Amino acid sequence: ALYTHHQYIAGFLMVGAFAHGAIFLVRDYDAEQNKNNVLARIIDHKEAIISHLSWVSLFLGFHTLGLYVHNDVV
């Protein structure tokens, strides 16, 4: 019960981390003031980060599911 307690909270804390960073980008972020730093560069190639996260999500899920469905059928 102690492992399962803190891991479910850690997932809620890690989801809420990206959630409150997302609220910062609508409310508090100012692209005319924030330019050419680390923050305004990650926004600049944000399509490169999502699509490469779109691959490793789809790379594992195609294969470790098929590795399971192989072992099921066999």
Binding site: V26, R27, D28, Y29, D30, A31, E32, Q33
Partner: protein, 139 residues
């Protein structure tokens, strides 16, 4: 003006219309002259019959008046519909046509309300308008 009393169409029905909201504040009435004795669907249920008229119908919402006012322009080509909203237990007379003409037609003397002298990509960031009474789209 509203010209009440004016004859209601020969209808007799519709649970779905003009409940307790109408008697306290803000119901509407659409008035037209129908050039037949023909049947038309209501926004409540469907039929009535349009009179020779001076025809009038008391509706609950303005949205139901423009929906019926579109049907009289579509199916019967009677575009003379003239909606209203009532007095002391209502708010504002003569809602449409507001300047003697339909809103899709141009009429000089109207003033551009809600206009912006900028594009939408020229909208400021909300961080520039933070902790102020300004909003990120008003000018």
């Amino acid at each position: 003006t509203l010209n009440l009393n004016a004859p209601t169409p020969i209808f007799g029905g519709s649970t779905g219309g003009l409940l307790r909201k109408a008697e306290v504040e803000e119901f509407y009435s659409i008035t037209w002259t129908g050039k037949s004795e023909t049947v038309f669907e209501l926004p409540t249920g469907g039929a009535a019959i349009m009179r020779a008229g001076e025809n009038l119908l008391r509706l609950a919402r303005k949205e139901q008046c423009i929906a019926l006012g579109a049907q009289l322009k579509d199916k019967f080509k009677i575009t003379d519909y003239k909606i209203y909203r009532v007095y002391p237990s209502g708010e504002v007379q003569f809602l449409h046509p507001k300047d003697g003409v339909f809103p899709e037609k141009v009429n000089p003397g109207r003033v551009a309300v809600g206009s912006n002298k900028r594009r939408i990509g020229q909208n400021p960031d909300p961080a520039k308008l933070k902790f102020k009474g300004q909003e990120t789209f008003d000018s």
